[PDB]
């Protein structure tokens, strides 16, 4: 009797209750919530049709099967394996066959990326089909049975059916029962002929001994099968472990043109950076022809140790003082952040490895005119300026590694050498990391300095301040954003629109880049030449480092791209604000009927009409906007803007979470308008004065504060408590939790570490000063929208949101557990105080 047979007898003896516990004990599982609701609403983009896409991805990620050419998918069902293959580098056609009909899954039609190369056929019994030529054979057929010999016949049947479909090609075949001796005998003969190996997918439930015969591998079937039997037997006795939750796959949207995908690198511009990386890592430098990059040019890899983690570190002090939130899913989903090479690669494939169609010639003309006008407007008072070593060094001080480098003369000597290459129109070492010795660290910081030197002026000199740019909100700060949205709401016209671009930085075109670059025209000759090196050699020819996991260990890939924004490069905020202002002006012109479909298609479009609209209405239309990077709030002259989608989608600025051609929905109540991850409420204090306050789902606030020595953990907790008291004092639970943290953390301990990296954060809470004096300075004294300067002497006079509004935005007020928490607060304070030690603490309400 095999171990698998012992496992089967035990599984069949389990009661219904203990079977439901065991089946998912310690397993990996994708969260199907979003996809199931999306499919229920009839959505055809992004969603995977079943858990199958995730299941196949696990194999593909690990190079166990690398689908390519003509893919055939036997028993495709709903199509999860097929729609996943459709977006892979080397796949040119996916033919899926499934039985369908009563008791069988039918193919679910979709518009995910590459749907156009997907051919799902129902009414196809694979056991009646003559084998076809194919480059990848996939098969996921096998119905379970309490009898293992019934499964044995089903498994041999599938094995005999698949075999003739194999001829030196890729495969991934389910083996329903691999533990029966005759199945092992059959697999051993199959491995001698076709190779491959048997692998267990962790996403498989414990109620099945299924394994997959994959083409890329070798190894001992008997040993691999028994290891699974042993794991599965051990899971019966093992104390119940909840499944490891992973984020489900994003299969994108739209048609795939395989010939449009590849990147053609400018080797004359990037060749030297590749040569130097190759030199520094010559001992492990290799060219991996099995790399997954479709739209990024690949140049080689080097071996590296793995960096990252599946989840975030939890803050113990704040968790202890926020007990009702242990049970809330959104709070724990915050900690769900996969930064492993597997996590990086998933994000790269779904978000970065895309190509935006060139905008039409009329769209390019409109953008060119708007850009020339906008830079002139932005440069009316200020002149561009070079930033310096002294400036960069000051900014760094206000990483310990960065402070060491800037104090080192060798770092500056390397910078000078690279600057001399930039002056000759050459780049030798300027690279950025998507996610991935001191020479490498110095080359990176030097790249960031040289970008800062040439383009730091846009941020440093406040080019996107509301005063300089009209639409900008730079230097404003969270507490001022709402007051600006309230002021914009006073402008008559349409609703306030707030459409987010799906991954903005990947939607930045070679045309956007050429328009952003136009600022060089206002620079002095020596500045012009340095900024022109950045734009041309580095921003329009990006050389990037990215980690990738392989069956033999982690590698660092060197990849390149001409278009898109370099997210790991300086000036991203300012360049995004500039292009978003321009794109929003173009969409306003279309909504006004100034810019037509005929204009967008016109190769010899006339500037006259656009120039008149900009010179006469431009600044007025800029004033109708609040633009902060990729994020915008637009209040147009009327609602035609909602239906104005031609120039927006043609520019490549496709809106997130909405079909391409569906009109936008806006708001007339400014307090419901989303902006920079927040919405803003207008409150009336006990004294009758009004306050405009920042707000967001309370679980996002708690969840974030719950992410990380003890002293550092307590100090970071205190920083979150003080930010809450200054910015989110109107949230009942946050003021109570803030008071609890400050009582539990030593009073003289000055908060350390940032609570956020937001450009809108001025960190007035990073102090030992009394929080009510800081509150008064922020909310009354320095507040330009507060006319009456009378201070507030008590927190009782610092207002809360209305009970219903506090509840709508996630408050737990009115729940029994929240009431128990409030009663149990002095106890939670004592527990943290006990752990910290015998220090000086104070009591807060």
Ligand X SMILES: Nc1ncnc2c1ncn2[C@@H]1O[C@H](CSCC[C@H](N)C(=O)O)[C@@H](O)[C@H]1O
Ligand Y SMILES: COc1cc(C)c(C(=O)NS(=O)(=O)c2cccc3cccnc23)cc1-c1ccc(C#CCO)s1
Q: Minimum Å distance from CB 525 to ligand Y? A: 38
Q: Residue 274 in 3-state DSSP?
A: helix
Say if strands 244-247 and 625-628 run parallel, antiparallel, or are unpaired.
unpaired
Q: Minimum Å distance from CB 324 to ligand Y? A: 19
With vertex at residue 269, the alpha carbon angle to CA 265 and CA 274, rounded to the nearest 5 degrees, is 75
Q: Confirm if 352 and 293 have CB atoms less than 8 A apart.
A: no
User: Which member of 226, 758, 783, 824 binds ligand Y (CB under 6 A)?
Assistant: 758
Partner from ligand Y, ligand X, Zn ion, none binding residue 341, C-beta < 5-8 Å depending on class: none
Q: Any binding-site annotation on 172? A: no
Q: Minimum Å distance from CB 526 to Zn ion? A: 17
Q: Confirm if 752 and 719 have CB atoms less than 8 A apart.
A: yes
Which residue number has the CB closest to ligand X? 52
Q: Phi-psi category of 423—alpha, beta or left, where left has phi over 0 and alpha has psi -120 to 50?
A: alpha
Nearer of residues 126 and 270 to ligand X, judged by Cβ: 126
Active-site residue, selected from the candidate residues 105, 135, 151, 174: 174
Contact between 676 and ligand Y per CB under 6 A: yes
Contact map string, positions 496 to 535, toward Mg ion, x by CB under 5 A: --x-x-----------------------------------
d(CA 530, CA 67) in angstroms, rounded, equals: 45
Rg over CA atoms, the chain:
30
Nearer of residues 64 and 702 to ligand Y, judged by Cβ: 702
Nearer of residues 79 and 549 to ligand X, judged by Cβ: 79
d(CA 128, CA 11) in angstroms, rounded, equals: 33
Q: Any binding-site annotation on 28? A: no
Nearer of residues 76 and 737 to ligand Y, judged by Cβ: 737
Q: Which residues bind Zn ion (CB under 5 A)?
A: 418, 427, 430, 695, 809
Contact between 756 and ligand Y per CB under 6 A: yes
Q: Which of 103, 51, 95, 57 is nearest to 76 (CA)?
A: 95
Partner from Zn ion, Mg ion, ligand Y, none binding residue 700, C-beta < 5-8 Å depending on class: ligand Y
Q: Is 423 known to be catalytic?
A: no
Partner from Zn ion, ligand Y, Mg ion, none binding residue 758, C-beta < 5-8 Å depending on class: ligand Y
Q: Confirm if 587 and 644 have CB atoms less than 8 A apart.
A: yes
Nearer of residues 4 and 482 to ligand Y, judged by Cβ: 482
Contact between 631 and Mg ion per CB under 5 A: yes
d(CA 429, CA 416) in angstroms, rounded, equals: 12
Q: Confirm if 66 and 90 have CB atoms less than 8 A apart.
A: yes
Q: Minimum Å distance from CB 536 to Mg ion? A: 31
Choices 118-126, 143-151, 664-672, 755-763; region in contact with ligand Y by CB under 6 A: 755-763
DSSP one-letter code for 522 = G
DSSP per position, 475-505 = TT-HHHHHHHHHHHHTS-SS-BB-PPBTTGG
Q: Confirm if 789 and 689 have CB atoms less than 8 A apart.
A: no
Which residue number has the CB closest to ligand Y? 762
Partner from Mg ion, Zn ion, ligand Y, none binding residue 498, C-beta < 5-8 Å depending on class: Mg ion
Q: Which residues bind ligand X (CB under 6 A)?
A: 50, 52, 75, 77-81, 98-99, 104-105, 124-127, 140-141
Q: Any binding-site annotation on 50? A: yes
Nearer of residues 125 and 638 to ligand X, judged by Cβ: 125
Give the length of the chain: 845
d(CA 249, CA 216) in angstroms, rounded, equals: 23
Contact between 706 and ligand Y per CB under 6 A: no
C-beta contacts of 189-193 below 8 A and 24+ residues apart? 190/159, 190/163, 191/218, 191/221, 193/163, 193/166
Say if strands 690-695 and 244-247 run parallel, antiparallel, or are unpaired.
unpaired
Encoding tokens for residue 46? 């992004």
Q: Is 210 known to be catalytic?
A: yes
Q: Minimum Å distance from CB 755 to ligand Y? A: 7
Q: Is 250 known to be catalytic?
A: no
Cβ-count burial of 805 within 10 angstroms (0-12 exposed, 13-18 middle, 19+ buried)?
middle
Encoding tokens for residue 79? 């199509």
Distances (CA, A) of 161 to 132, 150, 155, 158: 12, 17, 10, 5
Nearer of residues 228 and 496 to Mg ion, judged by Cβ: 496
Nearer of residues 98 and 501 to ligand X, judged by Cβ: 98
Q: Any binding-site annotation on 567? A: no
Active-site residue, selected from the candidate residues 55, 319, 480, 653: 55
Q: Minimum Å distance from CB 760 to ligand Y? A: 4
User: Which member of 30, 66, 71, 723 binds ligand Y (CB under 6 A)?
Assistant: 723
Cβ-count burial of 622 within 10 angstroms (0-12 exposed, 13-18 middle, 19+ buried)?
buried
Q: Minimum Å distance from CB 185 to ligand X? A: 24
Q: Any binding-site annotation on 430? A: yes
Q: Minimum Å distance from CB 679 to Zn ion? A: 5
DSSP one-letter code for 613 = H
Q: Minimum Å distance from CB 726 to ligand Y? A: 7
Q: Any binding-site annotation on 126? A: yes
HEC profile of 444-465: HHHHHHHHHHHHCHHHHCCCCC
Q: Minimum Å distance from CB 362 to ligand Y? A: 35
Partner from Zn ion, ligand Y, Mg ion, none binding residue 477, C-beta < 5-8 Å depending on class: ligand Y
**How many residues bind ligand Y, per CB under 6 A?**
16
Q: Any binding-site annotation on 422? A: yes
Q: Any binding-site annotation on 387? A: no
Nearer of residues 761 and 835 to ligand Y, judged by Cβ: 761
DSSP per position, 772-828 = HHHHHIIIIIS-TT---------GGGS----HHHHHHTT--TT-HHHHHHHHTHHHH
Cβ-count burial of 141 within 10 angstroms (0-12 exposed, 13-18 middle, 19+ buried)?
buried
Q: Any binding-site annotation on 91? A: no
Choices 42-50, 352-360, 374-382, 759-767; region in contact with ligand Y by CB under 6 A: 759-767
Q: Minimum Å distance from CB 707 to Mg ion? A: 24
Nearer of residues 139 and 496 to ligand X, judged by Cβ: 139
Contact between 700 and Mg ion per CB under 5 A: no
Q: Is the dihedral of CA 690, 696, 698, 702 positive or negative?
A: negative
Active-site residue, selected from the candidate residues 140, 151, 250, 557: 140
Nearer of residues 587 and 760 to ligand Y, judged by Cβ: 760
Q: Is 55 known to be catalytic?
A: yes
DSSP per position, 281-313 = TTTT-B--TT---SSSEEEEEEE------SSPP
Partner from Zn ion, Mg ion, ligand Y, none binding residue 695, C-beta < 5-8 Å depending on class: Zn ion
Catalytic residues: 55, 140, 174, 210
Binding residues for ligand Y (CB under 6 A): 477-479, 676-678, 700, 704, 723, 727, 756, 758, 760-762, 764
Annotated binding-site residues for S-adenosyl-L-methionine read 50, 80-81, 98-99, 125-126, 141, 212
Binding residues: 50, 80-81, 98-99, 125-126, 141, 212, 418, 422, 427, 430, 679, 695, 809
Which positions lie near Mg ion, rule CB under 5 A?
Answer: 498, 500, 631
């Amino acid at each position: 009797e095999t171990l698998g047979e012992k496992w089967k007898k035990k599984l069949n003896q389990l009661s219904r209750k203990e079977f439901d516990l065991y089946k998912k004990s310690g397993i990996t599982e994708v969260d199907r919530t979003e996809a199931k609701e999306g499919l229920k609403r009839g959505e055809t983009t992004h969603h995977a049709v079943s858990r199958g896409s995730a299941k196949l991805q696990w194999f593909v990620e690990r190079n166990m099967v690398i689908p390519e050419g003509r893919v055939i998918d036997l028993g495709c069902g709903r199509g999860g394996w097929s729609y996943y293959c459709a977006g892979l580098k080397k796949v040119t056609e996916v033919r899926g066959y499934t039985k369908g009909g009563p008791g069988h899954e039918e193919p679910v039609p979709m518009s995910t990326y590459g749907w156009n190369i997907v051919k799902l056929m129902s009414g196809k019994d694979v056991f009646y089909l003559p084998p076809e030529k194919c480059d990848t054979l996939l098969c996921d057929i096998g119905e379970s049975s309490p009898s293992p010999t019934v499964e044995e016949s089903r498994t041999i049947r599938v094995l005999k059916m698949v075999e003739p479909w194999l001829k030196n090609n890729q495969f991934c075949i389910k083996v329903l029962n691999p533990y029966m001796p005759t199945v092992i005998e059959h697999l051993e003969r199959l491995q001698r002929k076709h190779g491959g190996m048997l692998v267990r997918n962790p996403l498989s439930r414990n109620s099945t001994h299924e394994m997959y015969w994959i083409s890329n591998g070798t190894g001992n079937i008997v040993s691999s099968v028994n290891m699974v039997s042993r794991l599965l037997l051990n899971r019966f006795t093992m104390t119940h472990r909840r499944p490891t939750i992973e984020k489900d796959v994003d299969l994108g949207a739209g048609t795939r043109h395989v010939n449009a995908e590849p990147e053609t690198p400018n080797m004359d511009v990037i060749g030297e950076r590749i040569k130097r990386i190759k030199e520094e890592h010559n001992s492990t430098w290799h060219y991996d022809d099995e790399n997954p990059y479709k739209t990024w040019a690949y140049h080689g890899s080097y071996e590296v140790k793995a960096t990252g983690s599946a989840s975030s570190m939890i803050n113990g002090v704040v968790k202890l003082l926020t007990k009702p939130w242990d049970v809330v899913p959104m709070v724990t989903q915050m900690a769900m952040t996969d930064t492993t090479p597997f996590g990086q690669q998933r994000v790269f494939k779904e978000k970065v490895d895309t190509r935006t169609p060139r905008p039409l010639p009329g769209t390019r003309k409109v953008m060119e005119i708007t850009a020339e006008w906008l830079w002139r407007t932005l440069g009316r008072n200020k002149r561009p300026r070079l930033c310096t070593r002294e400036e960069f060094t000051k900014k760094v001080r206000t990483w310990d590694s960065a402070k060491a480098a800037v104090e080192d003369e060798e770092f500056w000597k390397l910078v000078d050498r690279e600057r001399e290459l930039h002056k000759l129109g050459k780049c030798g070492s300027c690279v950025y990391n998507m996610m991935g010795s001191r020479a490498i660290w110095y080359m990176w910081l030097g790249v960031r300095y040289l970008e800062f030197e040439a383009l730091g002026f846009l941020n440093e000199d406040h080019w996107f301040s509301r005063e300089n740019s009209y639409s900008g909100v730079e230097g404003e700060g969270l507490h001022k954003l709402g007051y600006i949205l309230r002021d914009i709401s006073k402008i008559p016209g349409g609703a306030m629109y707030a459409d987010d671009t799906a991954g903005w930085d990947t939607r930045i075109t070679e045309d956007d880049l050429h328009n952003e670059e136009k600022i060089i025209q206002q620079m002095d000759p020596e500045h012009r030449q340095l900024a022109n090196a950045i734009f041309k050699l580095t921003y329009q020819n990006k050389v990037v480092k990215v980690q990738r996991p392989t069956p033999t260990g982690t590698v660092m890939d060197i990849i390149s791209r001409k278009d898109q924004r370099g997210s790991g490069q300086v000036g991203t905020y300012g360049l995004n604000t500039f292009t978003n202002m321009e794109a929003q002006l173009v969409r306003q012109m279309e909504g006004e009927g100034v810019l037509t479909k005929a204009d967008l298609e016109n190769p010899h479009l006339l500037e006259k009409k656009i120039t008149q609209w900009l010179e006469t209405k431009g600044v007025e239309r800029l004033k109708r906007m609040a633009i902060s990077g990729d994020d915008c709030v637009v209040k147009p002259i009327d609602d035609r803007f909602a239906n104005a989608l031609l120039a927006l989608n043609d520019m490549g600025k496709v809106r997130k979470d909405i079909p391409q051609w569906q009109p936008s929905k806006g708001w007339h109540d400014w307090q419901q308008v989303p902006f920079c991850s927040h919405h803003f409420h207008e409150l009336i204090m006990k004294d009758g004065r009004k306050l405009v306050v920042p707000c967001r789902p309370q679980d996002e606030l708690i969840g974030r504060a719950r992410i990380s020595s003890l002293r550092e953990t307590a100090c970071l907790g205190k920083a979150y408590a003080q930010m809450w008291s200054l910015m989110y004092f109107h949230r009942r639970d946050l003021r109570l939790a803030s008071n609890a943290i400050c009582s539990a953390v030593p009073v003289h301990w000055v908060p350390t570490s940032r609570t956020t990296w937001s450009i809108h954060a001025h960190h007035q809470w990073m102090t030992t000063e009394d929080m009510l004096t800081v509150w008064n300075r922020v909310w009354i004294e320095e507040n330009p929208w507060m006319e009456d300067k009378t201070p507030v002497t008590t927190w009782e006079n610092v207002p809360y949101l209305g009970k219903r509004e506090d509840q709508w935005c996630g408050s737990l007020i009115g729940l029994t557990s929240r009431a128990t928490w409030a009663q149990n607060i002095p106890t939670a304070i004592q527990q943290v105080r006990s752990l910290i030690g015998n220090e000086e603490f104070l009591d807060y309400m």
